[PDB]
Each structure stands twice: as structure tokens, then as C-alpha cells.
Enzyme design. Sequence first.
Site, PDB file in Angstrom:
ATOM      1  N   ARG A   1     -56.216  -2.798 -18.337  1.00  0.00           N
ATOM      2  CA  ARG A   1     -56.552  -2.220 -17.045  1.00  0.00           C
ATOM      3  C   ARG A   1     -55.488  -2.608 -16.032  1.00  0.00           C
ATOM      4  O   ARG A   1     -55.005  -1.765 -15.280  1.00  0.00           O
ATOM      5  CB  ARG A   1     -57.951  -2.679 -16.620  1.00  0.00           C
ATOM      6  CG  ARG A   1     -59.061  -1.890 -17.325  1.00  0.00           C
ATOM      7  CD  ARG A   1     -60.416  -2.596 -17.319  1.00  0.00           C
ATOM      8  NE  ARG A   1     -60.427  -3.753 -18.210  1.00  0.00           N
ATOM      9  CZ  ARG A   1     -61.500  -4.485 -18.494  1.00  0.00           C
ATOM     10  NH1 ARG A   1     -62.679  -4.191 -17.960  1.00  0.00           N
ATOM     11  NH2 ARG A   1     -61.389  -5.524 -19.313  1.00  0.00           N
ATOM     12  N   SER A   2     -55.099  -3.879 -16.039  1.00  0.00           N
ATOM     13  CA  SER A   2     -54.064  -4.372 -15.137  1.00  0.00           C
ATOM     14  C   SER A   2     -52.789  -3.556 -15.334  1.00  0.00           C
ATOM     15  O   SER A   2     -52.161  -3.117 -14.363  1.00  0.00           O
ATOM     16  CB  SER A   2     -53.771  -5.854 -15.416  1.00  0.00           C
ATOM     17  OG  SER A   2     -54.828  -6.699 -14.974  1.00  0.00           O
TER      18      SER A   2
ATOM     19  N   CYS B   1     -57.670  -8.316 -15.264  1.00  0.00           N
ATOM     20  CA  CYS B   1     -58.841  -7.703 -15.868  1.00  0.00           C
ATOM     21  C   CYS B   1     -59.404  -8.811 -16.742  1.00  0.00           C
ATOM     22  O   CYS B   1     -59.767  -9.866 -16.232  1.00  0.00           O
ATOM     23  CB  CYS B   1     -58.457  -6.475 -16.706  1.00  0.00           C
ATOM     24  SG  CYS B   1     -56.748  -6.442 -17.295  1.00  0.00           S
TER      25      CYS B   1
ATOM     26  N   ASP C   1     -63.835  -2.336 -20.573  1.00  0.00           N
ATOM     27  CA  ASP C   1     -62.739  -2.888 -21.362  1.00  0.00           C
ATOM     28  C   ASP C   1     -62.274  -1.776 -22.285  1.00  0.00           C
ATOM     29  O   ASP C   1     -63.094  -1.151 -22.952  1.00  0.00           O
ATOM     30  CB  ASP C   1     -63.209  -4.056 -22.227  1.00  0.00           C
ATOM     31  CG  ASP C   1     -64.009  -5.067 -21.456  1.00  0.00           C
ATOM     32  OD1 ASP C   1     -63.504  -5.593 -20.441  1.00  0.00           O
ATOM     33  OD2 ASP C   1     -65.153  -5.342 -21.873  1.00  0.00           O
TER      34      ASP C   1
ATOM     35  N   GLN D   1     -53.676  -0.683 -23.005  1.00  0.00           N
ATOM     36  CA  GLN D   1     -54.186  -0.979 -24.337  1.00  0.00           C
ATOM     37  C   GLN D   1     -54.689   0.185 -25.177  1.00  0.00           C
ATOM     38  O   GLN D   1     -54.983   0.016 -26.356  1.00  0.00           O
ATOM     39  CB  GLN D   1     -55.288  -2.024 -24.203  1.00  0.00           C
ATOM     40  CG  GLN D   1     -54.771  -3.379 -23.785  1.00  0.00           C
ATOM     41  CD  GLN D   1     -54.165  -4.096 -24.954  1.00  0.00           C
ATOM     42  OE1 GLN D   1     -54.859  -4.402 -25.918  1.00  0.00           O
ATOM     43  NE2 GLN D   1     -52.864  -4.355 -24.891  1.00  0.00           N
TER      44      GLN D   1
END
Length: 297
Positions: A220-221, A214, A180, A261
Site C-alpha cells: 500500500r505504501s 502499511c 492488505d 505487492q
Amino acid sequence: EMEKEFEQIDKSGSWAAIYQDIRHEASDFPCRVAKLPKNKNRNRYRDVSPFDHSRIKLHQEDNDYINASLIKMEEAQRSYILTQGPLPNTCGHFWEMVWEQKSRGVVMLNRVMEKGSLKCAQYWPQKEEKEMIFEDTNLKLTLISEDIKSYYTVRQLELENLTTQETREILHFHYTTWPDFGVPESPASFLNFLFKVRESGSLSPEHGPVVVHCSAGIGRSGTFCLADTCLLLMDKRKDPSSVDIKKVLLEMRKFRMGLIQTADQLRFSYLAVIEGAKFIMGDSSVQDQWKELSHED
Ligand SMILES: O=P(O)(O)C(F)(F)c1ccc2ccc(C(F)(F)P(=O)(O)O)cc2c1
């Protein structure tokens, strides 16, 4: 040159600045539906909601809501569906969606458990003798087979509409080593993984948008979709350097918030795109090199 610009940003340590510029310029649309009190338990995170204008709607009559967004990339000629990692109570919805959207593949970029905390729920069967039935959406799911690699596992799943008894083979691509707020373990691993998905035919226009997720379905997506779209972009517009990754991301954040992110994932996106570019503009071996370097075996 894509390389030159990348090194300039790196040399000046501007990744956080660029990334921060992206957050500030990013679109901001209403998420009325996502914020309706009843859908509170359908969102994994309070602050991550699909925009109303682009959210994927379940064709069910009760509550058509699911934390998923349709990222339609006009120029790149490709749509994806970014969604949060299914919750204990949204697994039926997830698959309902996968069914209604006629998706062929599902890209999972997180793990069902990260640091004692469940970043997602086991929404697909781990053993073939134990199919799953989501009674709320009347769907049956069965692990047909799976190819386990070092950092990713590709699974073949049969999704069945218990209502019509119709069946479909869903390809489940699970990157298992993408932390993450972390990044892939090399542009090679990532691209090796992205091209598997590509060659699977799951991203084909003959199928509904591939479902990518994710934990929150934005970091991540977002990284995965950004990279795929830019590489898609710098292949059709023959003049790859014109592809402005930062702007492509902004185009993307118009359909779902927070895509990418961390400043590091943004930097990785550039690395992966630059690296993957070698494929678009010749070199029919870098792919064997990524597979080699990814150490999937
Ligand atoms: O895929 P990643 O790594 O980007 C993520 F899923 F880990 C991630 C991304 C966005 C998030 C937004 C809010 C919360 C929250 F903790 F603030 P909230 O209070 O809204 O539940 C958690 C979040 C976690």
C-alpha cells in the site's frame, strides 16, 4: 496516450506480466543490518527489510535500526520514508524517527487489526485524555484532535521530545479501508485522500520526508508513493505521457523492496495516475468530483 496504453494492457490482461517483469527487474541490495540477529524483533516480516544503503537510522546510540527506508526521488523532488506498521516494541523507534527526520505527516494505509491478526500496533493515542509516552525514546504523543471520514481519518497529534521539551504537530493521515494486498475503493477515494495529504503541507520540502506505512510498508505504501511521484513527475516535465510508471516504480524499488505487492495495485497505480493527471493538466473540479465520489462524508 496514458489512457490508450492502460486499455491496451487491460485488453490483453498483461497486468500480471508487467507486474512480474517489475519484480524480476527490481534492484536487490543487501540488508545486512536488518538481518542482524539482534534486530530480528525489530522487523515485522522476515522477508521485508530496508536496504542498507537507504535504511533510516535512529540517532540513538544503542541500536540505530528501524525497518524503514528513505525513498529519495531525485527528479520528482520529493522524499518519503516507507516503514513497516510499528510493532509493540518499535513504537518508540517509529516516533523517534518521525522526530529526527523532522517529518510533518504520517500516512497510515492499513488497520491496526485485519482478520483477527494485528497488521500493526496502536502507536498513536485514540483518546485525547490518554497521551502516550514511549519511555525508551523519551517521547510523548498526544491526540489533539481528529477528523473522522468514511474511509479515512485525519488526526492532529502533538509529538514532544521529553528531553528538550520541544513540541511538534504531526498530521496523521489514516486510510482505513485499504485491505492488505487489496486496492483503494476507487481512484477517486485514493486521490481524494492523496490530495488531502498534499494540501496539508506534510509533503512540503520544508519538512522532513513524510512517513508512509502499511503493514510491511511496501504494498500500500508503495502504491501511495508511486502514484504521488508519477503525478508529481507529470506536472514538472510538461509532457505527462513520458512518465513511465513502471520505470518510476523501478526507480523506487531501488530504495526499498517490494513496492506494490499485487498486479492489481500496479493497475490501480496506473488508474490513479491517469485519473489524477486530469488535475495536473487543467480541470479544477475533478478534485471536487473525487471528494464527491469517495463518499468520505
Ligand atoms: O502490505 P502488504 O499487504 O503487502 C503485507 F504486509 F501484508 C505483506 C507484505 C509483504 C510480506 C512479506 C513477508 C511476509 C511473510 F508472511 F512471508 P513472513 O514469513 O516473512 O513473515 C508477509 C508480508 C505481508
